[PDB]
Amino acid sequence: YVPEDGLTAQQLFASADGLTYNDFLILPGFIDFIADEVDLTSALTRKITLKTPLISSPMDTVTEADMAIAMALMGGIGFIHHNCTPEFQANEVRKVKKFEQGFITDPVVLSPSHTVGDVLEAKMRHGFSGIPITETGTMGSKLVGIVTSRDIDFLAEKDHTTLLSEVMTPRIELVVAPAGVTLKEANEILQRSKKGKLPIVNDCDELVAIIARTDLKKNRDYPLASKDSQKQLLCGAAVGTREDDKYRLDLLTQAGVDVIVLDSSQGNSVYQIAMVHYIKQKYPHLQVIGGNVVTAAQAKNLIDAGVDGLRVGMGCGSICITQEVMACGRPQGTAVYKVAEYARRFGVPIIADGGIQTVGHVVKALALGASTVMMGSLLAATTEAPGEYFFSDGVRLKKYRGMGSLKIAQGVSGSIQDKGSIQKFVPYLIAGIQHGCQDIGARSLDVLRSMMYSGELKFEKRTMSAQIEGGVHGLHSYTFLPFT
Amino acid sequence: YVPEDGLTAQQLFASADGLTYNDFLILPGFIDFIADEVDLTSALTRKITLKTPLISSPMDTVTEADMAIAMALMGGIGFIHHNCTPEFQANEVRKVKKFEQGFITDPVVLSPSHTVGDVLEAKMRHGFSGIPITETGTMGSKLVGIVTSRDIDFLAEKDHTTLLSEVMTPRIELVVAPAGVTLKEANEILQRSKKGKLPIVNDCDELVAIIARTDLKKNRDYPLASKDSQKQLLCGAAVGTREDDKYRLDLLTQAGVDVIVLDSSQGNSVYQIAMVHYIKQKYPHLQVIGGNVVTAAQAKNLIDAGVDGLRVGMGCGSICITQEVMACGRPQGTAVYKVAEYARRFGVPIIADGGIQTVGHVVKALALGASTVMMGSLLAATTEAPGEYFFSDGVRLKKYRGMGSLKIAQGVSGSIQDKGSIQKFVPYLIAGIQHGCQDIGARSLDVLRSMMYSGELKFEKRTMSAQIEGGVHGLHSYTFLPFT
Amino acid sequence: GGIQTVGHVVKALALGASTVMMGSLLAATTEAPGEYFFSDGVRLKKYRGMGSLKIAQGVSGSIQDKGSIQKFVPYLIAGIQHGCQDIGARSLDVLRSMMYSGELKFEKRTMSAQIEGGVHGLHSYTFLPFT
Amino acid sequence: YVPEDGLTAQQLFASADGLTYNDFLILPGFIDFIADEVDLTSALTRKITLKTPLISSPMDTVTEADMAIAMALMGGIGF
Ligand SMILES: NC(=O)c1ccc[n+]([C@@H]2O[C@H](COP(=O)([O-])OP(=O)(O)OC[C@H]3O[C@@H](n4cnc5c(N)ncnc54)[C@H](O)[C@@H]3O)[C@@H](O)[C@H]2O)c1
Ligand SMILES: NC(=O)c1ccc[n+]([C@@H]2O[C@H](COP(=O)([O-])OP(=O)(O)OC[C@H]3O[C@@H](n4cnc5c(N)ncnc54)[C@H](O)[C@@H]3O)[C@@H](O)[C@H]2O)c1
Ligand SMILES: Nc1nc2c(ncn2[C@@H]2O[C@H](COP(=O)(O)OP(=O)(O)OP(=O)(O)O)[C@@H](O)[C@H]2O)c(=O)[nH]1
Ligand SMILES: Nc1nc2c(ncn2[C@@H]2O[C@H](COP(=O)(O)OP(=O)(O)OP(=O)(O)O)[C@@H](O)[C@H]2O)c(=O)[nH]1
Ligand SMILES: Nc1nc2c(ncn2[C@@H]2O[C@H](COP(=O)(O)OP(=O)(O)OP(=O)(O)O)[C@@H](O)[C@H]2O)c(=O)[nH]1
Ligand SMILES: Nc1nc2c(ncn2[C@@H]2O[C@H](COP(=O)(O)OP(=O)(O)OP(=O)(O)O)[C@@H](O)[C@H]2O)c(=O)[nH]1
Ligand SMILES: Nc1ncnc2c1ncn2[C@@H]1O[C@H](COP(=O)(O)OP(=O)(O)OP(=O)(O)O)[C@@H](O)[C@H]1O
Ligand SMILES: Nc1ncnc2c1ncn2[C@@H]1O[C@H](COP(=O)(O)OP(=O)(O)OP(=O)(O)O)[C@@H](O)[C@H]1O
Ligand SMILES: O=c1[nH]cnc2c1ncn2[C@@H]1O[C@H](COP(=O)(O)O)[C@@H](O)[C@H]1O
Ligand SMILES: O=c1[nH]cnc2c1ncn2[C@@H]1O[C@H](COP(=O)(O)O)[C@@H](O)[C@H]1O
Ligand SMILES: O=c1[nH]cnc2c1ncn2[C@@H]1O[C@H](COP(=O)(O)O)[C@@H](O)[C@H]1O
């Protein structure tokens, strides 16, 4: 027999003293496994599951098309901000969705009568090189040939008037697959064909769809990417709660959004509940994420309205000044614990929103019940963030401002310190998270939360001196160098 | 008639007051042309000419294979440092040379009896994907087939034992060109072939050489690259003046160095002159660059020894502490002017070495007679610089230390502030240089120096208050944001 | 007085001074009188002028520790002889002969070259003389 | 023939502008020898000669018996 040490989560938060991420620790356990065995699959909404617990917040300083793509390629997800025109946001969503497609049912096509100028224009506009050619120049017509970049490289920049009929590979020479073939078999006939495209045709011999080799190359290159049933990246977008956001929502849903995150400082309001009802009534197949909530009472009515996933955290963001504009707020540790313990019964996952500044906080938030963790400032200065770097005091920086920072300024605008590529940063966050889980002794995140709720995971309250002692405190100067 | 204003160069430097880059200006002239018309072709040695005036200094914190490639791809050149093993430096030189080749006379080949594991190993080791296959597995044998990446992608990671005979395209199907064909015609048969390779063969039907499409793609992508007669990048390397550097020089010359830069703090010495003579005696086809010199007398004996190009500047580097270890030195403006005016008669170009910190200094050094300008600190923290970034005080930095900074420390070690890609930084330097030349009114750099020597380009001496006034002085805080 | 670097040690020997007297460089070496004391996370030895105190003609300060004299002086000698070598002088007598005969030629250094003559482009740095 | 560069000492100090150690340099020359061949014997007085040019100043914060010994052991002297 060995004495019990530490306080269970319910015992630590029973005092109602207002703890946060920096005021407690997790006592370590046992290791019977290697860190890489840790499984990080985390639920985002009741019908969406991610292969990593990391999300990017919807703001005008993060989550462009580039950041959304770079996040979706590592299992996470990206929420495009709504501080922009409805058609601009829909364009960004379409751009994120059209990255890898499989069956491309709406490609770019042309006709023999077109000219090399047309293929060059299509290239310069979209980036798609391959262009199937059809009699009429649309899908509902017989296939004639395909023109790609390798057919345009050797031109002399003065024969652009040449008709595409003189550069396409004729239909008789193409390799195609009959319509109705499953993707697996289509990928097989593409690979054994050892070529770059397969324009699918039917018994009538007219183009129906097309497949590309670089798509399966990307699949082989990024095993952890997040995709829907059509083998294309998942994308999210934020929306307000005005009567004029219905048009924006319609535009987004036509663009192909998968999950919508209602965006407000406080979720508890008739205005938000009405839009949740509207979304569930007009788009029954769309996943909606509730607004900011910090309380069980603040959640109950949103869950009743029909939110598929909640977003917990208010007044806590590294840019948020709600706690000073108004007196309202709640420390993030208490908020996460006391909205997750209530939400677990109805099966609605939670998103620990704001306040994350280190892998320690990323693992703490995942320990307290948050299925996934949303993160705005850490990803603020990565290469994928929108904007262009600028040199402030002998250092290149990217601006970082809250989306409501400006009648009243609820936020602040600042600068962050450059971090390199998201595709090279996220793996380090994943490695740190799984190392922390290993040290705790958790086979996975679901087990990590099971240990907490059953009482097996025991915390200890950290005083101020231990908070200072918990960092680096005895050095004259130093450097960090995370591997990233 | 309008009065003459300003001091010619000879009038400005006649006072022997020890001016530098910050103590004078160039009065502006007339504009009858657009900036982009400025031609920046600059001589490096008596038999090497560059399409840009920028060089990277040989140091252990710059000019790796990556930086040398990134510089050679923009017209400049890169000098690989000699603070490394002879075989390591030779490997770096060979790596820089084997970037784009045209006729690849020593490719990687294999034989039917090999296995897919062999092609995968060659890929993982070198990076070359295409591998012509021959009966014996060497050049002196009949060609049988070629295996590339598109023939290996669809394998299942468990049939690696498969013989390459089951994946190569057989000789009967290949497209080849007869031996003795000129490169232009070979490139033509490659482009009209609309295919990725041409393994050259002779009347005996055995492999002699091979060409690649990505090489001419790079040629089309980088019009300003610097290459020798064999269509591969120029590379330079530094060497010491000991009796044991002969082996290093032999290894480098076998690796294919084009220009050698004798590396010493002071060039005037029997030890340096003896190695200049040795190089000219054993490698008559090699361009050698003299050591650091600051005086006409200091140059005369090196020119007599046979230096093909001089390197002017001593005690001036942003990291150099020679002026404090010893009393010797000379301000860079006076040194450049008074070693270029002497060197012009013998036709030996000059390299303004050290002290450059801005495009203003880059254009000042080119105005005073320096055919090309060598630059170590500006390129110090770019992505291509050797080493990995590290976070010091909320900012990621790359170390920058002088190659002699450590019996006695003649240098210092510090940090620099990250600058992004060389391929994205050098174009901004070129644009700034040509804008300055345009403002002066010079059609090109040769005209810019002609105006100075003839007296048409007139400077003015800048006092301390104008030095402060010449910058930014009235702002509380600010940002720069160069386009780069 | 006024010597602060091997550069000044060689400059003073170039201008005619047969030998050079030096007070501050040797101030904090282990052999200096007194005991080290920690001021701001650093152990230092006091350094004050002998007339620093009716009237104070001097000042009292602190210096930064330098290790043994027997391990410091050889580095000064090595630096001096390296500077003489770079000048091209077989010895100090020859170094002064060249100056008086006119063979040793100086150049006047302006303020910008004084800044340029040091370390000026680094964010932070370290020196580490071998000593 | 190679032009003369720089100012002799008498030419540099003729201006009576008040130069110091930080306001001038020595232009470099030629090397036909190794550094260790440099001989540093320096005269201290008319009847005393030292093997190094370094002296320690007489002050209450330097030149005790220990510093005088440590200096005399390297050719110099201690006051
Ligand atoms: N998560 C955080 O910590 C946090 C906090 C504050 C702000 N923010 C960010 O700033 C943005 C702005 O926040 P906000 O709360 O000021 O904006 P908001 O639109 O969510 O709320 C501001 C006001 O809008 C009103 N409103 C909403 N719908 C309405 C309707 N249909 N009719 C009439 N009035 C209506 C509300 O009553 C409220 O007074 C958020 O969308 C979010 O991106 C985040
Ligand atoms: N350009 C600058 O401002 C500058 C200044 C100082 C140092 N540096 C860098 O630091 C490096 C080191 O400079 P350094 O002058 O100390 O090194 P170096 O080898 O060039 O000279 C140092 C010593 O080597 C001796 N030496 C050279 N060849 C010899 C031989 N064959 N036999 C005997 N002795 C020989 C010289 O006599 C001299 O005393 C340089 O190569 C350069 O990269 C640059
Ligand atoms: N054309 C095409 N095929 C794809 C794409 N992504 C996956 N596939 C194919 O669809 C199947 C997906 O199974 P896996 O290869 O295991 O892919 P994965 O890494 O599990 O990725 P997911 O299946 O999305 O979880 C295989 O036949 C893939 O080759 C894509 O973007 N385009
Ligand atoms: N830009 C663009 N990409 C599309 C479009 N539709 C599908 N894609 C996908 O984007 C990629 C476009 O591939 P291509 O531009 O043909 O690529 P490529 O010419 O083979 O060149 P690389 O793949 O880059 O070597 C594929 O992954 C397509 O599935 C479209 O309309 N525009
Ligand atoms: N195979 C091959 N051919 C090349 C390469 N570089 C240039 N060429 C060809 O050689 C000739 C070079 O002439 P240009 O096309 O004008 O090239 P450039 O931009 O002037 O480059 P340089 O000729 O090196 O100055 C053309 O036939 C090119 O296609 C290369 O790396 N590989
Ligand atoms: N790594 C490597 N490159 C070589 C070698 N010899 C020549 N090269 C050049 O390096 C490039 C190698 O091209 P590959 O690796 O075949 O390129 P690829 O498979 O066509 O793929 P991408 O060109 O990157 O789309 C060409 O520019 C060659 O000319 C070698 O031995 N190793
Ligand atoms: N399905 C197909 N059947 C027959 N020929 C095809 C097919 N797809 C492409 N081609 C032809 O093959 C050649 C190049 O095909 P590929 O797909 O490699 O082009 P690409 O991918 O744009 O080349 P690159 O690697 O330069 O981007 C062209 O002649 C093109 O018309
Ligand atoms: N000269 C040639 N003649 C005939 N077939 C060739 C020739 N060169 C390559 N191939 C074949 O063409 C196919 C792919 O050629 P390609 O040069 O596009 O490969 P790759 O450049 O490695 O492709 P990727 O774009 O994926 O890198 C393979 O079947 C290869 O064996
Ligand atoms: O202007 C703003 N005011 C207040 N909160 C904001 C503002 N913009 C974004 N936020 C939120 O602040 C959090 C930012 O996460 P962080 O990385 O902890 O700063 C997220 O919840 C954002 O949605
Ligand atoms: O350790 C060193 N001491 C002195 N000079 C150095 C050292 N390393 C490099 N240098 C030179 O200092 C110059 C650096 O250029 P910068 O960019 O002006 O610093 C070049 O001449 C380098 O060759
Ligand atoms: O109290 C003082 N006032 C003024 N000069 C002093 C005093 N003490 C020492 N000195 C002199 O100042 C010089 C010190 O050399 P330093 O190393 O250049 O400071 C020597 O000439 C000392 O003799």
PDB file of N, CA and C and ligand atoms in Angstrom, chain A residues 57-59 263 292 311 313 316-322 353-356 374-378 400-405 410-412, ligand 9:
ATOM      1  N   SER A  57      -7.969  29.925 -34.858  1.00  0.00           N
ATOM      2  CA  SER A  57      -9.120  30.763 -34.552  1.00  0.00           C
ATOM      3  C   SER A  57      -9.506  31.598 -35.769  1.00  0.00           C
ATOM      4  N   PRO A  58     -10.786  31.942 -35.921  1.00  0.00           N
ATOM      5  CA  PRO A  58     -11.179  32.787 -37.051  1.00  0.00           C
ATOM      6  C   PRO A  58     -10.909  34.255 -36.775  1.00  0.00           C
ATOM      7  N   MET A  59      -9.856  34.797 -37.380  1.00  0.00           N
ATOM      8  CA  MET A  59      -9.504  36.197 -37.194  1.00  0.00           C
ATOM      9  C   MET A  59      -8.883  36.720 -38.477  1.00  0.00           C
ATOM     10  N   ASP A 263     -20.154  33.315 -34.242  1.00  0.00           N
ATOM     11  CA  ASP A 263     -19.062  34.127 -33.706  1.00  0.00           C
ATOM     12  C   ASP A 263     -19.651  35.303 -32.935  1.00  0.00           C
ATOM     13  N   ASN A 292     -19.496  31.764 -27.672  1.00  0.00           N
ATOM     14  CA  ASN A 292     -18.668  31.705 -26.476  1.00  0.00           C
ATOM     15  C   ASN A 292     -19.535  31.524 -25.238  1.00  0.00           C
ATOM     16  N   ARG A 311     -18.039  26.266 -27.801  1.00  0.00           N
ATOM     17  CA  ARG A 311     -16.767  26.979 -27.767  1.00  0.00           C
ATOM     18  C   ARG A 311     -16.670  27.689 -26.426  1.00  0.00           C
ATOM     19  N   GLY A 313     -14.792  29.735 -23.358  1.00  0.00           N
ATOM     20  CA  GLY A 313     -13.754  30.716 -23.122  1.00  0.00           C
ATOM     21  C   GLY A 313     -14.227  32.111 -23.463  1.00  0.00           C
ATOM     22  N   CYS A 316     -10.690  35.850 -21.998  1.00  0.00           N
ATOM     23  CA  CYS A 316      -9.426  35.213 -21.661  1.00  0.00           C
ATOM     24  C   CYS A 316      -8.374  35.319 -22.757  1.00  0.00           C
ATOM     25  N   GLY A 317      -8.768  35.631 -23.989  1.00  0.00           N
ATOM     26  CA  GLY A 317      -7.815  35.600 -25.085  1.00  0.00           C
ATOM     27  C   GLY A 317      -6.628  36.509 -24.825  1.00  0.00           C
ATOM     28  N   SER A 318      -5.491  36.162 -25.432  1.00  0.00           N
ATOM     29  CA  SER A 318      -4.276  36.964 -25.326  1.00  0.00           C
ATOM     30  C   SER A 318      -4.448  38.357 -25.901  1.00  0.00           C
ATOM     31  N   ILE A 319      -5.475  38.559 -26.721  1.00  0.00           N
ATOM     32  CA  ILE A 319      -5.821  39.858 -27.275  1.00  0.00           C
ATOM     33  C   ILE A 319      -7.110  40.409 -26.694  1.00  0.00           C
ATOM     34  N   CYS A 320      -7.873  39.592 -25.973  1.00  0.00           N
ATOM     35  CA  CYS A 320      -9.198  39.984 -25.522  1.00  0.00           C
ATOM     36  C   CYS A 320      -9.101  40.949 -24.348  1.00  0.00           C
ATOM     37  N   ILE A 321      -9.920  41.996 -24.391  1.00  0.00           N
ATOM     38  CA  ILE A 321     -10.051  42.965 -23.312  1.00  0.00           C
ATOM     39  C   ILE A 321     -11.486  43.042 -22.807  1.00  0.00           C
ATOM     40  N   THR A 322     -12.299  42.023 -23.090  1.00  0.00           N
ATOM     41  CA  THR A 322     -13.664  41.998 -22.581  1.00  0.00           C
ATOM     42  C   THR A 322     -13.686  42.168 -21.069  1.00  0.00           C
ATOM     43  N   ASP A 353     -11.187  27.700 -26.013  1.00  0.00           N
ATOM     44  CA  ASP A 353     -10.915  28.834 -26.893  1.00  0.00           C
ATOM     45  C   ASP A 353     -10.160  29.915 -26.126  1.00  0.00           C
ATOM     46  N   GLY A 354      -8.934  30.196 -26.559  1.00  0.00           N
ATOM     47  CA  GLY A 354      -8.180  31.321 -26.048  1.00  0.00           C
ATOM     48  C   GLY A 354      -7.378  30.992 -24.803  1.00  0.00           C
ATOM     49  N   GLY A 355      -6.300  31.752 -24.619  1.00  0.00           N
ATOM     50  CA  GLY A 355      -5.438  31.610 -23.466  1.00  0.00           C
ATOM     51  C   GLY A 355      -4.292  30.636 -23.629  1.00  0.00           C
ATOM     52  N   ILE A 356      -4.265  29.860 -24.708  1.00  0.00           N
ATOM     53  CA  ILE A 356      -3.204  28.883 -24.929  1.00  0.00           C
ATOM     54  C   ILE A 356      -1.932  29.625 -25.321  1.00  0.00           C
ATOM     55  N   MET A 374      -8.648  25.396 -29.428  1.00  0.00           N
ATOM     56  CA  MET A 374      -8.561  26.428 -30.449  1.00  0.00           C
ATOM     57  C   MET A 374      -7.458  27.403 -30.065  1.00  0.00           C
ATOM     58  N   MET A 375      -6.764  27.935 -31.067  1.00  0.00           N
ATOM     59  CA  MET A 375      -5.477  28.581 -30.838  1.00  0.00           C
ATOM     60  C   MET A 375      -5.269  29.679 -31.867  1.00  0.00           C
ATOM     61  N   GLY A 376      -5.158  30.920 -31.402  1.00  0.00           N
ATOM     62  CA  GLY A 376      -5.008  32.046 -32.303  1.00  0.00           C
ATOM     63  C   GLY A 376      -3.641  32.703 -32.315  1.00  0.00           C
ATOM     64  N   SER A 377      -3.025  32.873 -31.143  1.00  0.00           N
ATOM     65  CA  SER A 377      -1.800  33.662 -31.062  1.00  0.00           C
ATOM     66  C   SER A 377      -0.556  32.869 -31.435  1.00  0.00           C
ATOM     67  N   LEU A 378      -0.491  31.586 -31.079  1.00  0.00           N
ATOM     68  CA  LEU A 378       0.683  30.791 -31.421  1.00  0.00           C
ATOM     69  C   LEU A 378       0.877  30.732 -32.930  1.00  0.00           C
ATOM     70  N   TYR A 400      -0.706  41.400 -35.174  1.00  0.00           N
ATOM     71  CA  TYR A 400      -1.640  40.498 -34.514  1.00  0.00           C
ATOM     72  C   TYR A 400      -2.653  41.324 -33.737  1.00  0.00           C
ATOM     73  N   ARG A 401      -3.899  41.323 -34.207  1.00  0.00           N
ATOM     74  CA  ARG A 401      -4.934  42.156 -33.616  1.00  0.00           C
ATOM     75  C   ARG A 401      -6.227  41.362 -33.518  1.00  0.00           C
ATOM     76  N   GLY A 402      -6.949  41.582 -32.424  1.00  0.00           N
ATOM     77  CA  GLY A 402      -8.239  40.941 -32.258  1.00  0.00           C
ATOM     78  C   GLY A 402      -9.241  41.457 -33.276  1.00  0.00           C
ATOM     79  N   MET A 403     -10.150  40.572 -33.686  1.00  0.00           N
ATOM     80  CA  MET A 403     -11.105  40.912 -34.732  1.00  0.00           C
ATOM     81  C   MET A 403     -12.080  41.998 -34.297  1.00  0.00           C
ATOM     82  N   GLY A 404     -12.174  42.274 -33.000  1.00  0.00           N
ATOM     83  CA  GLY A 404     -13.042  43.324 -32.503  1.00  0.00           C
ATOM     84  C   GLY A 404     -12.271  44.456 -31.857  1.00  0.00           C
ATOM     85  N   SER A 405     -11.031  44.671 -32.302  1.00  0.00           N
ATOM     86  CA  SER A 405     -10.164  45.666 -31.683  1.00  0.00           C
ATOM     87  C   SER A 405     -10.335  47.061 -32.267  1.00  0.00           C
ATOM     88  N   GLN A 410     -13.027  46.335 -28.003  1.00  0.00           N
ATOM     89  CA  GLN A 410     -12.990  45.165 -27.137  1.00  0.00           C
ATOM     90  C   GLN A 410     -11.708  44.362 -27.305  1.00  0.00           C
ATOM     91  N   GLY A 411     -10.738  44.882 -28.049  1.00  0.00           N
ATOM     92  CA  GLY A 411      -9.530  44.135 -28.336  1.00  0.00           C
ATOM     93  C   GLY A 411      -8.352  45.061 -28.513  1.00  0.00           C
ATOM     94  N   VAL A 412      -7.197  44.468 -28.798  1.00  0.00           N
ATOM     95  CA  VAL A 412      -5.939  45.196 -28.900  1.00  0.00           C
ATOM     96  C   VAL A 412      -5.219  44.746 -30.166  1.00  0.00           C
TER      97      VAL A 412
HETATM   98  O1  LIG E   9     -10.964  41.784 -30.807  1.00  0.00           O
HETATM   99  C1  LIG E   9     -11.051  40.831 -30.054  1.00  0.00           C
HETATM  100  N1  LIG E   9     -11.455  40.990 -28.732  1.00  0.00           N
HETATM  101  C2  LIG E   9     -11.577  40.022 -27.846  1.00  0.00           C
HETATM  102  N2  LIG E   9     -11.324  38.761 -28.073  1.00  0.00           N
HETATM  103  C3  LIG E   9     -10.921  38.532 -29.343  1.00  0.00           C
HETATM  104  C4  LIG E   9     -10.779  39.468 -30.335  1.00  0.00           C
HETATM  105  N3  LIG E   9     -10.367  38.867 -31.512  1.00  0.00           N
HETATM  106  C5  LIG E   9     -10.268  37.600 -31.210  1.00  0.00           C
HETATM  107  N4  LIG E   9     -10.589  37.331 -29.910  1.00  0.00           N
HETATM  108  C6  LIG E   9     -10.593  36.010 -29.307  1.00  0.00           C
HETATM  109  O2  LIG E   9      -9.458  35.887 -28.490  1.00  0.00           O
HETATM  110  C7  LIG E   9      -8.937  34.541 -28.595  1.00  0.00           C
HETATM  111  C8  LIG E   9      -7.563  34.591 -29.197  1.00  0.00           C
HETATM  112  O3  LIG E   9      -6.832  33.444 -28.752  1.00  0.00           O
HETATM  113  P1  LIG E   9      -5.406  33.712 -28.132  1.00  0.00           P
HETATM  114  O4  LIG E   9      -4.450  32.995 -29.008  1.00  0.00           O
HETATM  115  O5  LIG E   9      -5.428  33.156 -26.753  1.00  0.00           O
HETATM  116  O6  LIG E   9      -5.276  35.194 -28.167  1.00  0.00           O
HETATM  117  C9  LIG E   9      -9.971  33.787 -29.423  1.00  0.00           C
HETATM  118  O7  LIG E   9     -11.062  33.402 -28.612  1.00  0.00           O
HETATM  119  C10 LIG E   9     -10.467  34.894 -30.333  1.00  0.00           C
HETATM  120  O8  LIG E   9     -11.691  34.533 -30.925  1.00  0.00           O
END
